[PDB]
Design a protein around this ligand. Structure first.
Ligand SMILES: Cc1cc(CCCCCOc2c(Cl)cc(C3=NCCO3)cc2Cl)on1
Lengths: 273, 40, 236, 255, 236, 59, 40
């Protein structure tokens, strides 16, 4: 492939460099339309800018935490982090968010990796070996109330059991309702006068729930869960302007008030170098 | 070799090697030729 | 039972590796795809669409006005604007090009810089745009500027002028984050003759300026952008 | 003697002529078309009023003055009250449509000024409150009036800051969306053909707008000496290939 | 010894994975199969059999009577019953259809709603059943109702009427647990003319109503049912 | 008008059955042409024959 | 590839792709045609 062809002096009536940008086109002008060039080859394919590659590496999408401790006398397991949940969403963390929001609709399978590490902030004789249980409560499913409920039975709910310190991994098809995931949605659930606005109304795919299978030892053990997400088989439509201001909420476009100028002011003139 | 039955479980896809910027760079209704005048 | 040996790296999680995994939802059938206009395949497809450069960066809070390069009637010989070409920083940085370049470590290729004139139709002007390849200082006067890559632009019916910064380089890749060894030059613009307004007309006229990449362009070695960060996870 | 410059669009019982055009944009290089069976889901036969809905409606005019910040209309909202298009809209459960948008602004060879005319698929607005304040319904359904970016923040309304596109992105990059400029010195109209863009084959016309049309002054209007300091901008829009499905009782929407 | 590397996920137990295992009972011979009528292969086979809907839900303890929709002689213009179509909740919820839908997250397809009349043979009646697609309110009077999907039913020799709620939807799947965006409409029924009893006869007559799915139907993404739970393991 | 002026007018034909339009909104919903004043000096609008009865009386 | 000798040790079975609701939806002795009267 040639990156530049050889081109010499020109004295024409045919001027490729004068255009009318009002038309909305970006005319494909090249170095050889306005200087004299020599042949050179590309030596490159643009492999690593493919959208599959761009969205295809694992990104941290969520960090939660649960603890193993005596539940005796706990009136609210959920509240004691005897077990937590993550109401599946990819808008939490902004690193992967900005990347995704470069497009309007996106379609992909997900591969999740879940790393779990334990901490024992206060005096323990040892490090126990705990087994985590991650179960996906599809919307319209009995939500775990306790840490050893009947829900954890998950007889129809896909669940994975792995050891703390270890990692769990699996992949999920694209479980979108539509033909693709809406990165943006300028509409509402229904024609109400108070109903929410955005995608937060469209992206209601239940939540994930973690818990430690093991009973309690004499000390307490903090287990912190990190969920990583990798898109595989990516398809993206309609590019948009990149995010400039900071994010404030999962699912709304809102930016913070009295934010700071995002364009760097010159130290000098327009004329400055 | 796929070891698994479902398609979601296969590895990453392989390069589009599609690439056609004209839907974005030249969505004009009447075709513009480089070198010919923009507005006639 | 077949005998195996495990190598160094067993059990590691590399966020960039690409392997098979069991599906959690065996046998599930995804929604059919329907057709949607606009599919993107490569980021290289989109960085060829031009977008406006806030060249007039001199303000103090972001304003529509930093997209406008002003022009003065009757000045002769003088300089319209100047900038270095660190596409990952400074004026370029918020443009779509600048914004994507920042997802990669290295770039190579030609850039297309165009200026669209917005003054009254009955006015006229001749400007010179000059690209100064690495190695010399930003030009200080047109004489200096005109000895490097340049285009005399004659403002006419055809409203825009497309200047190309041809890839001039020893090393075949430059770093997107500004680096010296790897630096690309300067871009300046001066009156060639001068802007002239018709009667009954007055004041400043402005040029809009765009930037996009030539088909020439290469970007490689993906990394994280300095353009976005956060202090606590977002909630609903 | 054909110029890129003169054009005629006849759609239904209405025709537009421009003698100073700058080509026309067809979003994503695709022209509006009906919904194919292979893409269909709802089993209902659809209704295609054709020429009674696919004609040109001219919205009320705006006034560009030196202080203007820009205006924003949503589709199909802007047309919610135009003739039979609108009736069909409130009466069917689902509908689908593409449009021809023609924005008009003429001046003289002594004026200067340049407007950006852009179509943004799925333009989800931001609350000026920040945090996770929502933007109430009424605020994103201004009707033919559209939203005036130089009007004041209101409560439950969107933010109207132009250099952020009403969503946290910079004005400068709106050029990645199908768009066309109106530069008084060149141009006097802008025309964009919009194909139907959605993640579902057909949708509700009232709970979801699928494009915002935005007209934004970028190079300020500058009139000749002792000229009146303003110009009107007119927007005329025509639904094209419209289909309605799931007819019934007639939606009642807030406010 | 062949060199290997283990990946992330090694040692995990995913309740949904499908692999081989050693048999604990090597060489055991299972009992021969004999023929048994009734084999089921798909849950889609059984949700097409219709079952009764406790439409008359207004009681206070479960009774045979909530299966009976009453009809009054001589009323004109008035409304016989109304319900939304959240097949995973409310009247539908205990029906076989409702009961299976609850094992899945998403459903799509047409529903078949039929009414069998049980009044004396010498009586007569004309009813209108109306389906109101998402987007409008439950109809408030027949005029409103008759502008959407409807069937005038004439009570005759043929005892049942089968109304179909054709799949009317933007999005190709709806959630089985009630959700707004995803909501399906309303179903109402009104006197078209009115029930008329023969002489020597009196009181209320009832309609029985059934629900089953059309062959159209799709259910996907299995999950756990809210319809059953427990607090301690059962013993003998 | 002078050559250096400009204007955009709408001509509308309203078929029998409605009143003479009272504002452009009303006018623009019937047969109409947006005329852009340019180099080409004249605009030709056609009142297409819209009628139930195939002849009308001249008086 | 089965690694094991016994049939119980193989993975899950593969979709019936049988599907015939008529034993449940139309177990009538004399065949009913849709469109013809139910009771003659
Ligand atoms: C956009 C967008 C995309 C997504 C992803 C949605 C996730 C779908 C459900 O994914 C899971 C499934 Cl199918 C199973 C499990 C799981 N099975 C056993 C343990 O976890 C976890 C998840 Cl997140 O969210 N917004």
């Amino acid at each position: 492939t040639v990156a530049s062809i050889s081109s010499g002096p020109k004295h024409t009536q045919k001027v490729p460099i004068l255009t009318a940008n009002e038309t909305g086109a970006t005319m494909p002008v090249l170095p050889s339309d306005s200087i004299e060039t020599r042949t050179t080859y590309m030596h490159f394919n643009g492999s690593e800018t493919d959208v599959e590659c761009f969205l295809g590496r694992a990104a941290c999408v969520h960090v939660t935490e649960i603890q193993n401790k005596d539940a005796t006398g706990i009136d609210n397991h959920r509240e004691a982090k005897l077990f937590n949940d993550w109401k599946i969403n990819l808008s939490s963390l902004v690193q992967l968010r900005k990347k995704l929001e470069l497009f309007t609709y996106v379609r992909f399978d997900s591969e999740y990796t879940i790393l779990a590490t334990a901490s024992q902030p206060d005096s323990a004789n040892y490090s126990s070996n705990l087994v985590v249980q991650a179960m996906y409560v599809p919307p319209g499913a009995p939500n775990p109330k306790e840490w050893d409920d009947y829900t954890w039975q998950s007889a129809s709910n896909p669940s994975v059991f792995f050891k703390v310190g270890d990692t769990s991994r699996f992949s999920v098809p694209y479980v979108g309702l539509a033909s693709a995931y809406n990165c943006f949605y300028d509409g509402y659930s229904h024609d109400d006068a108070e109903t929410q606005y955005g995608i937060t109304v469209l992206n209601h795919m239940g939540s994930m729930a973690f818990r430690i299978v093991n009973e309690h030892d004499e000390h307490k053990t903090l287990v912190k869960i990190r969920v990583y997400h990798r898109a595989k088989h990516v398809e993206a439509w309609i590019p948009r302007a990149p995010r400039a201001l900071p994010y404030t909420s999962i699912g709304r476009t809102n930016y913070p008030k009295n934010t700071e100028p995002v364009i760097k002011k010159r130290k000098g003139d327009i004329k400055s170098y | 070799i796929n070891y698994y039955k479902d398609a979601a479980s296969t590895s990453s896809a392989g390069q589009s090697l599609s690439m056609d910027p004209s839907k974005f760079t030249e969505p004009v209704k009447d075709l513009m030729l480089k070198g010919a005048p923009a507005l006639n | 039972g077949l005998p195996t040996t495990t190598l160094p790296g067993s059990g590691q999680f590399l966020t960039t590796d690409d392997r098979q995994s069991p599906s959690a939802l065996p046998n599930y059938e995804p929604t059919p795809r329907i057709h949607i206009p606009g599919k993107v395949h490569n980021l290289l497809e989109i960085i060829q669409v031009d977008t406006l450069i806030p060249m007039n960066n001199t303000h103090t809070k972001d304003e529509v006005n930093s997209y406008l390069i002003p022009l003065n009637a009757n000045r002769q010989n003088e300089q319209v604007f100047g900038t270095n070409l660190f596409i990952g920083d400074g004026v370029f940085k918020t443009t779509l090009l600048g914004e994507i370049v920042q997802y990669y470590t290295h770039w190579s290729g030609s850039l297309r810089f165009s200026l669209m004139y917005t003054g009254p139709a009955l006015s006229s002007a001749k400007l010179i745009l000059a690209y100064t390849p690495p190695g010399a200082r930003g030009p200080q006067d047109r004489r200096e500027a005109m000895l490097g890559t340049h285009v005399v632009w004659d403002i006419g019916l055809q409203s825009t002028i497309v200047m190309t910064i041809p890839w001039t380089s020893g090393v075949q890749f430059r770093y997107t984050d500004p680096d010296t060894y790897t630096s690309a030059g300067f871009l300046s613009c001066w009156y060639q003759t001068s802007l002239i307004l018709p009667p009954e007309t007055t004041g400043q006229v402005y040029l809009l300026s765009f930037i996009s990449a030539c088909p020439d362009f290469k970007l490689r070695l993906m990394k994280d952008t300095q353009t976005i960060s956060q202090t606590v996870a977002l909630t609903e | 003697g054909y110029s890129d410059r003169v054009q005629q669009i006849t759609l239904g019982n209405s025709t537009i002529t421009t003698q100073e055009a700058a080509n026309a944009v067809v979003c994503y290089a695709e022209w509006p078309e009906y919904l194919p069976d292979v893409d269909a889901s709802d089993v209902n036969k659809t209704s295609k009023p054709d020429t009674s809905v696919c004609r040109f409606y001219t919205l009320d005019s705006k006034t560009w003055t030196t202080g203007s910040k820009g205006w924003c209309w949503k589709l199909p909202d802007a047309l919610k009250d135009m003739g039979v298009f609108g009736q069909n809209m409130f009466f069917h459960s689902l509908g689908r449509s593409g449009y021809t948008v023609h924005v008009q602004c003429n001046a003289t060879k002594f004026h200067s000024g340049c407007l950006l005319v852009v179509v943004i698929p799925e333009h989800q607005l931001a609350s000026h409150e920040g945090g996770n304040v929502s933007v109430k319904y009424t605020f994103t359904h201004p009707g033919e009036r559209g939203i005036d970016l130089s009007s004041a923040n209101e409560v439950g309304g969107p933010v109207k800051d132009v250099v952020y596109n009403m969503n946290g992105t910079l004005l400068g990059n709106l050029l990645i969306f199908p768009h066309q400029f109106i530069n008084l010195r060149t141009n006097n109209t802008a025309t964009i053909v919009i194909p139907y863009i959605n993640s579902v084959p057909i949708d509700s016309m009232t709970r979801h707008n699928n494009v915002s049309l935005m007209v934004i002054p970028i190079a300020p209007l500058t009139v000749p000496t002792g000229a009146t300091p303003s110009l009107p901008i007119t927007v005329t829009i025509a639904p094209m290939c419209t289909e309605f499905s799931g007819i019934r009782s007639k939606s009642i929407v807030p406010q």
